[PDB]
Symmetry: D2
Subunit: 465 residues, 4 copies
Amino acid sequence: SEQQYRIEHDTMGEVRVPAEALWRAQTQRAVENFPISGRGLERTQIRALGLLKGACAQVNKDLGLLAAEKADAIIAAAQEIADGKHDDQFPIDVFQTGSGTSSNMNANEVIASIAAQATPPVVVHPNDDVNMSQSSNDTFPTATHLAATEAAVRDLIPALEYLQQALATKAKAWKTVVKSGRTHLMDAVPVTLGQEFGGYARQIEAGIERVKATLPRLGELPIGGTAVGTGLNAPDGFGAKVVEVLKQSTGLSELKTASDSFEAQAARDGLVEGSGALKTIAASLTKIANDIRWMGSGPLTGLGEIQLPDLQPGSSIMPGKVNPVLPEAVTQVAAQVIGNDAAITVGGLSGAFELNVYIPVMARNLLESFTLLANVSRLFVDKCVDGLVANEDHLRTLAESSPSIVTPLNSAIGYEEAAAVAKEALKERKTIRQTVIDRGLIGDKLSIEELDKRLDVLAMAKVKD
Amino acid sequence: QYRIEHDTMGEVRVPAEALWRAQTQRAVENFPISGRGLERTQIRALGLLKGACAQVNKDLGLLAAEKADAIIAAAQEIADGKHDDQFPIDVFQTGSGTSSNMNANEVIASIAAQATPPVVVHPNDDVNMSQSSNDTFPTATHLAATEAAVRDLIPALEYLQQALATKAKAWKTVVKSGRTHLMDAVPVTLGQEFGGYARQIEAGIERVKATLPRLGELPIGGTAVGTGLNAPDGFGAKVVEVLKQSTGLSELKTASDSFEAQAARDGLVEGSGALKTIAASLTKIANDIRWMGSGPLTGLGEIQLPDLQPGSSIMPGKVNPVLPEAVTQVAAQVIGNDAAITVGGLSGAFELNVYIPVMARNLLESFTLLANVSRLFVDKCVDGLVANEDHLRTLAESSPSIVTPLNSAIGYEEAAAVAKEALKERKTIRQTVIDRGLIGDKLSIEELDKRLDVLAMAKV
Amino acid sequence: QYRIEHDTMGEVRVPAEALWRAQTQRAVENFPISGRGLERTQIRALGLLKGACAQVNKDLGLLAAEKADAIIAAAQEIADGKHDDQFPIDVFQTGSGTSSNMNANEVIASIAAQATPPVVVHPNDDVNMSQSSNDTFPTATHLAATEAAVRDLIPALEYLQQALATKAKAWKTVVKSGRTHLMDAVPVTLGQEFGGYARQIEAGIERVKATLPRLGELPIGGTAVGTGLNAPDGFGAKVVEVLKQSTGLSELKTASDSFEAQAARDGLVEGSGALKTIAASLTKIANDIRWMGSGPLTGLGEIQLPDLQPGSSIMPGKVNPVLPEAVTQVAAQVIGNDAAITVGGLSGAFELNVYIPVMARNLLESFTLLANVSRLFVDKCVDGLVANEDHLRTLAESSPSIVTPLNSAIGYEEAAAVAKEALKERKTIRQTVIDRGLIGDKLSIEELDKRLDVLAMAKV
Amino acid sequence: SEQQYRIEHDTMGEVRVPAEALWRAQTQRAVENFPISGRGLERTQIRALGLLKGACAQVNKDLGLLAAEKADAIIAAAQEIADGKHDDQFPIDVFQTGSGTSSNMNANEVIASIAAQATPPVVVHPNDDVNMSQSSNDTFPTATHLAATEAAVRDLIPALEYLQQALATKAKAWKTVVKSGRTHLMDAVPVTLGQEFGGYARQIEAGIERVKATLPRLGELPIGGTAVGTGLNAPDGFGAKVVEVLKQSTGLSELKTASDSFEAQAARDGLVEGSGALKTIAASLTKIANDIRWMGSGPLTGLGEIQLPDLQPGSSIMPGKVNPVLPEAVTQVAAQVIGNDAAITVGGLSGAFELNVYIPVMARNLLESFTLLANVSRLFVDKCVDGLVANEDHLRTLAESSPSIVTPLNSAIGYEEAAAVAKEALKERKTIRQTVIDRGLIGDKLSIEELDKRLDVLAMAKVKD
């Protein structure tokens, strides 16, 4: 049958709210007001709002500001929200008012409805009780920084740690697997596949380092500053006490009150800082994934250096073809993180006076970047990196083929003559060794024995470990 | 509960009720990255194309009538959105969209298998006949994009432009002070400003339209690499003919070059730059409007915005410009999406750019956000705007820069001295001119008053 | 050694030999930020406009002949680049370009003061007559930008497109293996690929041309806020008339809306998106070319690039694709410049966008880099490219995916099994088909050989 | 008269080089090859190349690889280059080969020409001697990271420190200067001008923090890795010894050898990381500069909160008008840094195998961002921030005018009634105080004395210090 409504109200009047909804008047307005992307807060963001609302109620209870029956009912309802029992009750668009007033009221209203249908029913006012000592202006970006910290510490870093270990495992397994270095895409001097993969492992290690270095500021929460950062209508030390509860319940050691309470509301520069770390990682990952698909290019017309695990038929039309789908997923994610970074930057620069009103869009983009990076990193290990196989014979051949293996003769014959040696070898399809012989260079400056010691490609890659 | 399906890589457990098969199931397992799949508009576009392809194969005698008809019927179901739950593959799939192409192929086969009469079609040999993912998936993308441009954004933009033009006219004699550098300038009317904003949106429409020639190019018929191998002479022209007849999009066309259309997605980058420009226009229009609405008492107080919702969970009675906030945040998102599309576009290699799904995702999102926010910006903000005309008049008469039209009579340097004296002594411009002894051969009182008139000065 | 000049803020020490005056000197002191000033092209554009304005004031009887003639002569000197050392103000000046406008005004006055006969003109009252910085400086910007688009980039792009088209033709039967996802695909010809690249550049030209309608709009005549205060009826139309006659740029026009043209610089954002697209095209073309040239022995080895310089200070005899490196780095720069122009464009407030100098700087730089690198890309790279035809032929015949045209005879799944067997046993496709017993009712030997022909397969 | 040339040569043959030039064959080729932007290396980049070439020669001398006469002549010539005596001898475009081969050869050739015209002349070979133990692949990005570290530590940070001190000085001077907070551009609750400026000071302090947190990786130099990162043709410990010389001569404590020698050449992710710090600062600065020009907007039709120092006549046409030119310079710079960041990102993601060949473009953009930020920050202090004057009476009036001063009544009368109070006050142009009275709210929940204590605007801004 037809959609049913019950009446709710706010300070602007009465609103018809769908009968099955736990949200009330202000949420419903926002539903009518912002039907823009059709996407609302993520699971991670609803969880954070839930945890925060509970902690605030806890502290209000602790300080005698909110009666136990009310506080306990708000905390039980907030726990349910944290646990994901009410995600369908947050229908508000990402592209709502830029302070998140609407989503803050969403949480307030939902908690009130939950508390009213409990056993026994408990009446809490969405503003006076569930929002006691709070503004959207501290709580909504607090929930944002909390979720972002969580994603950094529990989601991305562990994934990156796992990717790094998988790369370092190839660095060790392939330490003496000689091949031709390539600079500018042209034949350079020998390296090992291991040394390359050690490179990649460091890119990822430095990525972990990058994420960590943002945490001291990504971790700052404005809770306590209420409307403008003055903390009006909040008790002394409210923010400190909320953060203490949140640190205890989440186990996130990096959460802290803001250094400056006006900076933490007038700006979301911490979100801009965190995005810069992930855009760096997108650059590292693009590089890594690219070298891997290039190395796996073929079977026959490419570089043919390594074999990637087959994951799915490559082509609706070319039968038998298999494609480096995982590196494609990695490089597409990197592109998304880069675009998201730019969206965060615009948001970040557009604050005015006491409030940056781009929190939902910045929240959306930063958290997405974290999720995509974390997920793609784990898949990159399990469905690509771990099962790579080196084509070792073909790789030694490549190493031996570069005319630039003449390079270690520089100290003996000089750069100019060595260049002539390389030009001649290649013009006459001769080996560097025979060309050296032919050009009359064996003598006091260079014996045959020195020439062979020096052209040894594995020796030339100078394996350190 | 699971059933076994197979592909050329072997056998795969697929959920029993699911209409997709082996290749789709692997994609579900391989790319759980974002948890978001193709949008409604993309699924629709895929369905229409698959029906179009089967129509052409049928017309040309390549695909038997029973098989073609079963595919056409099934693709129409997909197009109409009866099977969106049957497209579970992530956006962040293989960059050609092979997985989503096979997803359409597999789901069509399953629908056909249970139709009346039942008909067995092979996902590769029949439903993918004469096709590659490399031409069809960007064709569906460019089809979705052209549909969004023409039927969604342009109309929304036309609606916003009309609302602004309406204000340009309604407020044509509403004089106020111009501001340049944020400082008191000479007189303008609120209407002039809104005529400015209306042109920005009109120019936005021109900017979207200018991209259609290349945005509407579809690589269909180029198959695997652009050469048309395995497709018959004229497959593309004919599929595009069918798509124009069914969709009514006049802008669709075959690619000028069938290699450019698969090796690159430059038309998507081009489309995005149009959108990026509109983002910038909309940021400006929206900012001016929130600044004009600022107060009640501590800002500029030029106009009143329709109340849409309580502004503050803590500050009672306060109302906030929530709609210009939606707009400016949508603009930011479009700028981000543009950077993503840019990274994708520059990253092609040889016969295939393999960033189609991320490019497609970001371009289509910018379209929808812009179209949706634009309509709302009219109905919930622009239409209800109310000018505080007397306060605006007061502002127009308060700017010391109204001394400007005296330049030709007293010269810039003396006019500057008039301005500075007026300001420092808290005197009017007129009185300062008089005080400084400028009435005489230089300038009559009649002229002074004629030229200091703020409504004349705004030159409607 | 210094002399005293003054403005309405008071007296300023100016270097004695300098032709600029008080307002320019303050700008020199206020903005030592980048150490870079207006480019040659910008100074030229300013000079032409200032002469154009004096011409119109003269025609309309607003500026006496002696004064107008002195200004016209002086502005022509500036235009021809005889006084670039007299424009020392930083790019990062007041965002309206007031400082550079006064710089032109002051230098003109000084030139006029020492001309024959000598003529005293006032920088504000005479040389700036009927003008603001708010219309003239963006007019000069849009004039420079239109000049760069039409006389610099488009011709360079036409030159690159011709060089690519030449290769498209010269190499039309040079068969090689296609690559999609970086993996062995079906056959293409090198020419087809280069036809692809040529279309990208041809589409680039179309993309630049499509921006001219709005890029060539000049706010001239709108003066301080867009209302035309202090300028006579038709000042803009008339200045633009003169500029078209002198420059021969057919694309210059007055603004559709005189407020949009000063409140925003959206035409610059639009122009940049065109350039950004070209950056992406050029990255792709250049990458393919460096990858095709990769080796001598450890890469793909498809083509040889003209040697331009020793590649390595340490690796003797090595040569590197230095020109595609210049191109791809130019592309990056253009993408950056685009982000800068975007931040500028969205940041207008009321009657004036005050980011004109940074916008102007980045748009004009993208133009010059692209035009310059494009010409070089032809003369020092594309023209001299040499195809290794026999190696390419070997690649075309080596791809296991040449089994593809058998789909209609043996079906996708069997063809896949043929490919996999060929690869695993190191057998040819033809032999594998035979081995797997497929010759018969399905497929004759004559047909197998007809369809496996790589040059036919590329379908020229 | 006509341009004169002398003949030089490299391994590709003979080149005509302008007679007054100290560069030789390979530089001249690059001049003909890359006439793209018409801009070459900056003063900072030539200095770094000069310092590096000297240190390499020093270490080669120390280890017995290069004879004293040769080393001493290279070091004297390198010193002259470091000191800026030969900037006109680096004519090569930014948009040269992406490893900087050309600029590395530029330095090698110039040093050789200097050494030849010394007293007595000393012949050093540009490859064999001046480039001993080096590649462009380690030296050019070493000179880049060195210059970037220098700009961070000696240029930006000190400027930012100076901007921060100037902001904190206003934070203290204006601590009790009450005014109306603004959120969403609408009347909020009172703040002081000081609290706002404390916000800004923290944004800049967190910017210093951001720059510092990149240094451990921005400081890594690949010197020692030579061609591919294997250090072939370099002695054991070459990089360590060069860095030791460079640390001693520059006083830059943050310089260090690379953690992974292949990461430091295959990538310039450190440059991407440094750019992310500065783009965050661009966001902070845009915000700060914006609030300042808005506060200074007027004289009569704006917010009229503060007076900015006049720096120049504002308008060629509007006489007497003065414009916030410095904030305009700040916000334009911020835009440039943002665009530069994106150019760096593209470069950073585009590496292949053993070498990222986008070093010149990335170098160009990062260093520019540093210079512009450093210069604009110092001017922002001296020509704007330091001499700001608060319009204190007008600001108290603004504070007293916001209908949102009803906010501290929430705990006494409830959010809904307080909203009705604010709506009524404003509809009937009454004060919040009188409206409270009129609505019959003085009673047991709220005395007249409590109502006056609570509406006190300076008390409501809750000054902490």
